[PDB]
Design a protein around this ligand. Structure first.
Ligand SMILES: Nc1ncnc2c1ncn2[C@@H]1O[C@H](COP(=O)(O)OP(=O)(O)OP(=O)(O)O)[C@@H](O)[C@H]1O
Ligand SMILES: Nc1ncnc2c1ncn2[C@@H]1O[C@H](COP(=O)(O)OP(=O)(O)OP(=O)(O)O)[C@@H](O)[C@H]1O
Ligand SMILES: [Mn+2]
Ligand SMILES: [Mn+2]
Ligand SMILES: [Mn+2]
Ligand SMILES: [Mn+2]
Lengths: 334, 412, 408, 411
């Protein structure tokens, strides 16, 4: 894959509309910490300007900082995302989205962006400005398929438990990854972690058999857990940590927005063993940056945070209800 | 043994005790602290003048409550007698123990009747972590039953400082560097950011000793401490962080010293390099001749066996088999359990008792199954196995590790 | 109140043996592991009171699946013991069966035996109808049928209504009763006036000519009830002008001591009676964030300040609206909460049980296995034991009695 | 001065709560620093012994900084070369009956301990784990602390006293660990408790106890009644309460004093922490009454409180955010001024004020109720602020800048 250098969360969510504040990344891990302030929407700003992925249940531009909280009649946001690419052809592209208001309305629209191609010396070059072509091209040189970064790599903090809903949505969703008999290895990598991490003495191995569902294997017969399923979130984690591994690889690797939901000690200590094994086996691969957003001490203190990075990108909030990311070294976490 | 000859200094080499490993297993939940107490008991009656160790005393940087109780309990009543430690301290130890007013070795305190010292370095498993940049060994030194050296303050600025002890006509120089991540050590060794201060009096007389805690062979490119980087004037090294235990010493033809790898005590990872017997060593050093070694074994390690066997090894295994593979592995574990139990029976029988048919401690067993079809055939399916925990939930009451007897890995 | 339960096949539990769980006061915690069935106790506690299949249980499989045992005809028996608000110990045994054919089963529910056990043990079957116990046991308990299936016991799969969909769904909760319950009295009282409003005609015709002596005997009874229609309508406006406005007097009070102090400025529920021309008096609910002096739409603008208050909504409303039996299945509260929204949630959760001890009872079943919260709620002052569900060698989930002395 | 050759001295502490607020930058070291100060006050007061009524550590499983601070503190103040004059009468195998450490550490032939510190366990750091282990049990293995008064079965409680002798005086130290309050209540109901009394030399003995339950509990049957303790006690020390009262609680029918030595750190901001926090010294003499000389703690951030009613004061219209914020602020920023003035006086009145010396920031709590107006049933209450905008706007000026003001409504 290819790394991401920076984004630009200017005037979105809880970061102020005045000052540009972006945080940077780490390799082969990008740890984030803090109280539930910025973090869960840091994941929202990568696909936001890449494909125009507004959050579901959002039409009136709720994501931009509301003018009434500040107190003026013209507030907006920008995202220009100075990041890398496949052959090191770094790029910058801004999404000119505004919360500007009419007489008493909240009319929503856009403006033109950019398609610069950053030179290794500095002589950049733009291509074409259209936002439709923006969402056509930024995935093209970004890599990962146009239906995976929103759900698999950069999922939401509560769209994470997606595969355990119903057959039809998932069955029509899997077409986009296929971009239309090729499904043979995704369930192959769906159970070794299940054997390793999931200390459950009930079930052998899940599959995704065609009604795409969450079939348990109870003594070689399929005791379906679609409706008869912690096992849900854990199976969801593994389903993501196979789809991120098989199909597409050119941007990020994995961004687990609080994977450790509803799992106990004999599961929480064994949770990150498969993460470490994935890091170590996939560190032969030229790129990996496991983005975890977590405030679980018994989860952080197992995977030896002081053994892979010198920093966790911490997020806090100032006096004026603006979140300000600081820089605290690896040891200082308790 | 008897007391050493009045100009012989005797030291004991332990390492990687890892007390508190698997503290929740009902059976294998007292291996570590029992083994540690056995090492200390093998120290007290062996008439050893000091104990060194290459770190990793506690398993995690925040050791549990039972671990600390065990270590304090073992060190307290078995190290402290009215016998003086004849190693006279002539240096000013205020530099090496600089973290507080405790600026001297344990046996030189007017408040300790410690009859045998034990110098230990920090480990990457119990490194400094939290808010105050604090190690569990810094907690133990605060009790004074251990002595702590090798602690780093700046990763880039490294100043190792020996300690100097005196008895008869034997000069002991003790260089110690704690455990820091290997990439920073390689950077500090690239530019020569280290200092190895050498005593300026009576050269050619001192025994120059080193205790490193770093990896030996790195599968990556440049993430380990190489052997050719330590200085020339050394005489012996103790190489922690490698759990495999080997009794001999590997000789350097250029470096003016030999290497030692004391190994570990407990079996953390049930791996192939974990199946080699645990030893605690004895070094009898004395001016005028090469110091000798008397490696002594341990009688308080639970029996272990290992067999990383793929399903491709034995014939007569169809890909679709589920009962057949389980039955074959069942009888293989049966054979290994028989072998381990009979060797355990002989081990307990050759202690002095052979008539008490009381019990037989369960043998830790590990199976590693690479269930991969041969690459020549094009059949999509693999060699199917059972649930690893419930494949081995039928061994409970016969095996020390009830659940994780097997691990079903893959390897091309 | 709730006293006991016995699942004999529903979910992971097996049909060949029943397992009893003895609830106590004021809280009974059910910790476990992901697959043991710690929420199945509550999911069946809301079956044995309300007789509804818990959410997303379709295709018939709520019972112990036959193919994990082999039995052609599998059957279960759910047996709830509860002391009714009237005071009748009604051991509401229920029966569930699944008749699996060669290929296709026919999920058929059999009758139970609703029996009010008195202090002499006279087992008198109060009722037997299969499709009637569901509408009858809520009457014995003392609460509506929609507070039980949405608030009193709620399932994690559908445990996010409060801070979620409003008009489209949140109202769906409030409009199915009360608005359709007090209008039953209203429509009845509308006609009780109407038979008396045309009564004055019978009087007024007699004077136009027995009919003169019984003439003006109910001329004021004609408007004895005319005044009393708004004595009921202001028994409605005053009702949801204090009952509803004492849930926003708690939601604020609940929130103002949770998120290390608090969280998003203020939050309430928008009670703006949108009197449309289909029903006259009406309602329309909505929950919004009141950041600095005006409201702002909460939907799609929030973060698990979400979940943390979903509970604060569910825990609030069923303490004045449905407060004859203090039963709440607040299960797994700690999910995506930071460090002090887990410390002062338990401090608030302690306070909730610290003041509901003057009432008849409060029932709380915390179903979680996060050792942070397990020490936060401090079960070392309120209960002498905790229950763990765990599987076994044959994957039959049992129920323990593992004492608090073990808990670290 | 040295206690006279028949005088014992004992520093009574409780709830020192090392490990409280470990990560707060402005206040993250107050707890262990105060423990360090009280132990230093032990070393330079010639105290024979240090007793503890539990809860010494704030968590069940402590932190490395907490443990190291406590051990480094104890090594500096308990280890010495003065011969501890305590002669021991009992067999400490019956009392430290957990394991082979059957002698007190000041009796150890390899430790020349000058002052022993012995304490019962506490509610926050109770016997917890697969082995029923306590942090004070770890500090018993180090040879610095004497963890006593452990309880192993909740149904039958046997208390075993350590018995020290000195000159012509005797001591008895009955421990009482942290057991859930009804469990001790039920065990006290049916006489499931026995109190060993030495059978020789009646009246020669001083009987000291350390108890760690609630004194007057909000729940019905979850408080230990003071009457239940037996008549032969001469004193008792009550933990679990964060309120400090310097005086004693003399009973007229049970003939035994109580003490409530409070805490060291201020755990929960409420009225209970707005009092002077001391630590107490007892000189035990036979034939003469005990004397008590409490000493204040001097490393505690200033804490005064005020609880006032919001809706009581006129002009409070319950629909404005720019009309009540000023009224709240003019109280908070007044208490802050008073707190900083008091901190200035206490810190710099001792002949150290040629220049304006540095101040520690104070802890300030204000309790205001934002409930509905008493006459009406308005659908909108006061629009009051939160820590993110009423305590976060006070950075660099107050030391509790997340909970400066209290917002409840009186049910
Ligand atoms: N109808 C059923 N028949 C057989 N087994 C079932 C059925 N429903 C669920 N199971 C099994 O029982 C378990 C489900 O238990 P439950 O619904 O309480 O979930 P859980 O693990 O306790 O959830 P959480 O941790 O989120 O509360 C799983 O192991 C599942 O495979
Ligand atoms: N219009 C707005 N302008 C600014 N900030 C807002 C606005 N609306 C909501 N917020 C803030 O954003 C928060 C949600 O942020 P976010 O979703 O990143 O939460 P989080 O801290 O990651 O928590 P979680 O783990 O529950 O998702 C709200 O609770 C609120 O404080
Ligand atoms: Mn080791
Ligand atoms: Mn090591
Ligand atoms: Mn306390
Ligand atoms: Mn207490």
């Amino acid at each position: 894959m290819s790394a991401i250098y920076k984004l630009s969360i200017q005037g979105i969510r809880s970061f102020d509309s005045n000052d540009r504040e972006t945080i940077e990344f780490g390799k082969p891990l990008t740890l984030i910490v803090g109280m539930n302030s910025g973090k869960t929407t840091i994941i929202e700003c990568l696909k936001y300007a890449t494909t125009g992925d507004l959050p579901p249940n959002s039409k009136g531009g709720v994501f931009i900082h509301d003018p009434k909280i500040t107190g003026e009649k013209d507030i907006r946001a920008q995202v220009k995302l100075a990041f890398t690419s496949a052959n090191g052809l770094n790029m910058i592209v801004t999404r000119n989205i505004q919360l500007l208001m009419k007489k008493t309305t909240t009319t929503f629209k856009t403006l033109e962006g950019q398609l610069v191609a950053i030179n290794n010396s500095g002589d950049r070059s733009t291509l074409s400005t259209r936002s439709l072509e923006l969402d056509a091209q930024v995935p093209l040189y970004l890599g990962v398929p146009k239906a995976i970064l929103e759900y698999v790599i950069f999922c939401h903090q509560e769209d994470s438990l997606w595969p355990l809903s119903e057959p039809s949505n998932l069955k029509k969703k899997f077409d986009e990854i296929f971009q239309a008999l090729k499904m043979q290895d995704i369930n192959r990598i769906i159970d070794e972690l299940w054997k390793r991490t999931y200390s459950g003495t009930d079930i052998d191995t899940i599959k995704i058999r065609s009604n795409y569902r969450v079939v348990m294997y109870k003594q070689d017969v399929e005791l379906d857990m679609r409706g008869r399923c912690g096992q849900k979130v854990l199976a969801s984690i593994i389903i993501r940590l196979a789809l991120s591994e098989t199909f597409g690889a050119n941007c990020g690797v994995i961004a687990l927005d609080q994977p450790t939901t509803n799992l106990d000690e004999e599961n929480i200590e064994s949770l990150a063993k498969s993460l470490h094994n994935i890091i170590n086996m996939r560190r032969h691969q030229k790129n990996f940056q496991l983005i975890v957003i977590t405030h679980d001490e018994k989860f952080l203190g197992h995977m030896n945070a002081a053994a892979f990075t010198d920093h966790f990108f911490k997020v806090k909030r100032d006096d004026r209800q603006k979140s300000q990311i600081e820089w605290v070294d690896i040891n200082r976490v308790t | 043994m008897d007391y050493p000859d009045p100009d012989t200094i005797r030291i004991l080499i332990t390492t990687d005790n890892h007390v508190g490993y698997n503290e929740n297993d009902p059976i294998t939940g007292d291996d570590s602290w029992k083994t540690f107490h056995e090492v200390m008991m093998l120290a007290k009656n062996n008439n050893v003048d000091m104990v060194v160790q290459s770190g990793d005393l506690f398993h995690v940087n925040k050791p549990s409550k039972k671990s600390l109780y065990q270590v304090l309990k073992t060190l307290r009543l078995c190290c402290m007698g009215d016998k003086p430690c004849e190693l006279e301290l002539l240096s000013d130890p205020s530099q090496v123990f600089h973290y507080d007013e405790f600026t001297n070795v344990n046996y030189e305190d007017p408040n300790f009747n410690i009859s045998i010292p034990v110098f230990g370095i920090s480990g990457n498993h119990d490194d400094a972590s939290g808010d105050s940049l604090l190690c569990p060994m810094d907690i133990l030194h605060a009790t004074g039953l251990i002595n702590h050296f090798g602690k780093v303050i700046e990763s880039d600025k490294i100043k190792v400082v020996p300690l100097l002890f005196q008895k008869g006509s034997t000069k002991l120089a003790l260089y110690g560097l704690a455990a820091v991540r290997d990439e920073r050590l390689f950077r500090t060794f690239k530019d020569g950011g280290v200092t190895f201060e050498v005593p300026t009096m009576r050269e050619g007389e001192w025994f120059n000793l080193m205790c490193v805690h770093q990896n030996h062979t790195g599968h990556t490119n440049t993430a380990f401490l190489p052997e050719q980087f330590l200085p020339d004037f050394l005489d012996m090294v103790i190489w922690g962080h490698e759990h495999e235990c080997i009794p001999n010493l590997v000789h350097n033809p250029i470096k003016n010293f030999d290497v030692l790898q004391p190994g570990s005590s407990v079996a953390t990872s049930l791996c192939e390099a974990e199946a080699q017997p645990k030893y605690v060593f004895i070094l009898d050093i004395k001016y005028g001749e090469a110091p000798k070694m008397t490696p002594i074994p341990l009688e308080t390690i639970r029996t272990f066996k290992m067999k990383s066997i793929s399903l491709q090894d034995v014939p007569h295994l169809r890909p679709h088999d589920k009962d057949a593979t389980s039955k074959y592995l069942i009888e293989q574990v049966e054979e290994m359990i028989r072998d381990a139990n009979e060797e355990t029976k002989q081990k307990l029988a050759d202690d002095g008792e052979g008539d008490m048919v009381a019990e037989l401690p369960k043998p830790l067993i590990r199976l590693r199954v690479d269930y991969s079809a041969p690459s020549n055939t094009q059949s999509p399916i693999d060699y199917q196995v059972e649930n690893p925990r419930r494949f081995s939930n039928r061994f409970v009451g016969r095996v020390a590790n009830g659940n994780n007897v097997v691990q079903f890995y893959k390897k091309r």
